[PDB]
Amino acid sequence: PKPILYYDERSPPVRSCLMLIKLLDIDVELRFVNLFKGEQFQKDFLALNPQHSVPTLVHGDLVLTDSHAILIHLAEKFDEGGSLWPQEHAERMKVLNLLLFECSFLFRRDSDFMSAIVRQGFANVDVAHHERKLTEAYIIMERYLENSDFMAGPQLTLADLSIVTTLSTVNLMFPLSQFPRLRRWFTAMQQLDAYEANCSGLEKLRQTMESVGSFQFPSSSAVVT
Amino acid sequence: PKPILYYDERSPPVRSCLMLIKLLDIDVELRFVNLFKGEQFQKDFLALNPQHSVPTLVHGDLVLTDSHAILIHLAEKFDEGGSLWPQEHAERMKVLNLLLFECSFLFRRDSDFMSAIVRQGFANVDVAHHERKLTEAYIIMERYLENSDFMAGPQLTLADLSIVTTLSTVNLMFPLSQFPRLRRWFTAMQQLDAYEANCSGLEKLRQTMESVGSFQFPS
Ligand SMILES: N[C@@H](CCC(=O)N[C@@H](CS)C(=O)NCC(=O)O)C(=O)O
Ligand SMILES: N[C@@H](CCC(=O)N[C@@H](CS)C(=O)NCC(=O)O)C(=O)O
């Protein structure tokens, strides 16, 4: 049976799975769950994923409720032996380490900021506080890239797919002027054909946030190529 | 060389790694990083881990900066063919999915609550708000346990090691009386020889939080 992806493309971790699906030409059925309309609290979706989060994948009997498990599962099933989720143990641990950085640090901080805008309205958010927390994530990713061309080594891996979507979301608000390696890496990701899967949801998230939060992102911040 | 574990046993993800190390008899060199003195910001540790977090594992040239990668790495290198990190793909993805639940949901929410204490003082924290967020996590784990004795199936896995330490930390503040499956699972986890690895750090966290929070946990 073909994988079923419950999704809202405004979500960065959803867009990471959409990028992998495009990169590998995976046939997947998409089922939209509108997060800003609260459809993730619908009783049948809650029964499927009590964390009420997207992406959720159903593939046969398997139900995955975290983008990072979804990326790993799809790579193992549709890129066997590939370099996205590498075969050598130490290389694979490095990718796993960076996936968890995305989950535990970069996404956590971007979610904290964006959730505050939705709950409080932009004018009531302590933007300076979130600028510090997210610039700290920029600094860390800049350090990762001072060693390798890609986040987890010399070539594109699942870590880049996970990180680039949330990075593009942070960068709607906060500029990358001071981060040359991060800008070089982001520019290169934007040249990838798979990056087309990030574009639509990023823009829909931009429009939704500006509406619900009653503000405008500074147009000069976002890196476009 | 033997793995090096940078740790502060007050950290629940540290304690998860300590439990696995004891369960598998792994010979490791422990290096204490006092989080309450800010030693995670010392220049050499920051150079090692820019996220300034424990646990951090150095194993040869490999540097891991997240407990969930460390658990998987140590299981793969020291417990090949074990049940903690199952070899069958569907079972392994199930364990991975629960490891990420611990990272993304349970630990996130407990960390939000504990950080609010250290920042604001216990007397100023919106306790009811965090009670709702953390009770929601209890409700989810209770459902995870409906058809299995452990978090990811009929056997103990890495998911149980990761979740039990944070669970015990949430349980400093919020009791398990209303969750029969979760309470029975936690009691069973406490019978493990390896659970002794959780005991010392949990009580150190209690004592440290209560002094800095100028409060006492209801437990
Ligand atoms: N760590 C999880 C994070 C998933 C997550 O929190 N998704 C957000 C959207 S970016 C969501 O579904 N929010 C809906 C809700 O929490 O109710 C993953 O990587 O999939
Ligand atoms: N997702 C990470 C979380 C690690 C983490 O946040 N550890 C806390 C202690 S519980 C820490 O080191 N805090 C110090 C700091 O953030 O400066 C993991 O599982 O290892």
From Swiss-Prot, chain B:
Lineage per the UniProt record: Eukaryota, Metazoa, Ecdysozoa, Arthropoda, Hexapoda
InterPro entries linked to this entry: Glutathione-S-Trfase_C-like (IPR010987), Glutathione-S-Trfase_C_sf (IPR036282), Glutathione_S-Trfase_N (IPR004045), GST_C (IPR004046), Thioredoxin-like_sf (IPR036249)
Chain ranges of the GST N-terminal domain: 1-82
Protein name: Glutathione S-transferase E14
Function statement: Conjugation of reduced glutathione to a wide number of exogenous and endogenous hydrophobic electrophiles. Essential for ecdysteroid biosynthesis. May be involved in detoxification.
EC annotation from Swiss-Prot or TrEMBL: 2.5.1.18
Consequence of gene disruption: Embryonic lethal. Embryos display severe developmental defects such as poorly differentiated cuticle, failure of head involution, abnormal gut looping, and defective mouth hooks and dorsal closure. Trichromes are absent. Embryos have a higher sterol content. Embryonic lethality, defective epidermal differentiation and trichome development can be rescued by supplementing embryos with 20-hydroxyecdysone (20E), ecdysone or cholesterol. RNAi-mediated knockdown results in larval lethality at the second instar stage, which can be rescued by supplementing larvae with 20E, ecdysone or cholesterol.
Domain GST C-terminal: 88-215
GO molecular function (one): glutathione transferase activity
One GO cellular component term: cytoplasm
Tissue expression per record: Expressed in the adult ovary (at protein level).
GO biological process, one term: response to toxic substance
Catalytic reaction(s) noted: RX + glutathione = an S-substituted glutathione + a halide anion + H(+)
Keywords on record: Detoxification, Lipid biosynthesis, Lipid metabolism, Steroid biosynthesis, Transferase
Family membership noted in the UniProt record: Belongs to the GST superfamily. Epsilon family.
Note: Member of the Halloween gene group.
UniProt gene name: GstE14
